[PDB]
């Protein structure tokens, strides 16, 4: 039972981790734009 719960959990953890690496470019470009307004 716990093995099944683990796999479900690991899937969710995968998605959360993937999101961290997915929205990173957004903040990255935002920062650059803040410094150099013509950038985007």
């Amino acid at each position: 039972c716990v093995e099944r719960l683990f796999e479900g959990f690991a899937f969710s953890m995968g998605r959360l981790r993937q999101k961290i690496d997915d929205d990173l470019p957004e903040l990255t470009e935002s920062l650059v734009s803040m410094l150099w307004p013509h950038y985007l």
Binding site: P25, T28, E29, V32, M34, L35, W36, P37, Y39, L40
Partner: protein, 240 residues
Amino acid sequence: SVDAVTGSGRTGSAEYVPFTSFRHRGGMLRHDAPERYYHTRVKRGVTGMYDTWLILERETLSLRITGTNGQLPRRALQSTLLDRCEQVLQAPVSVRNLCKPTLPVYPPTEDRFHWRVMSHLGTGFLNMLSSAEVLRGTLALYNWRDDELNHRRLDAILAVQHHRIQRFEKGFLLRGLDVEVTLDGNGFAGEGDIHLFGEMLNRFLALYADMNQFNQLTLIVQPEGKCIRWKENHNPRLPG
């Protein structure tokens, strides 16, 4: 772009300000200053257009928005003629297109260029005149047309050097900077291009250089040894 955002509710006019221009009460923390703001975010939509998202019950907002045109045909833009100029003035005025229109220019992208992000961030720690390598690299970041000709122009920069200048004016001793750049004249369409390039560079230096410093530009044409010198100062000075 969004030029203005003003709404209306039970509190009267809702005076929102743009986020990036840091808000007075928000950043300055003083009285008689607003705490309402907005920011704009853009995403690429299915048609390649930018979808504008506004980052702010039943409050009503009046949005003043300037627009442009989207994905118009490549050929059409190069064959577009102009219509009559609105006759606001008493005299009739006809129009003439003096050149084929320049199509919209987008910032360079290959794989989003983490290298571009890094190039800009790195640039922030460098003096543009520290070397030819830096000068070429940094200037290249503005060549959004991907024009091989513009590349050859920049690639003609062989060396950058500078010296301190000791000069007099109106009986006073002033400091300045001698900026000397060696160019490969084969990268330009003769003096016409070399001069205009230099004129731009001279102007740029004026906007880059520090205060209480005059700047002159010397361009050397390596194939001949001759040079073009810019010795002028348009800044208000010596008020007393």
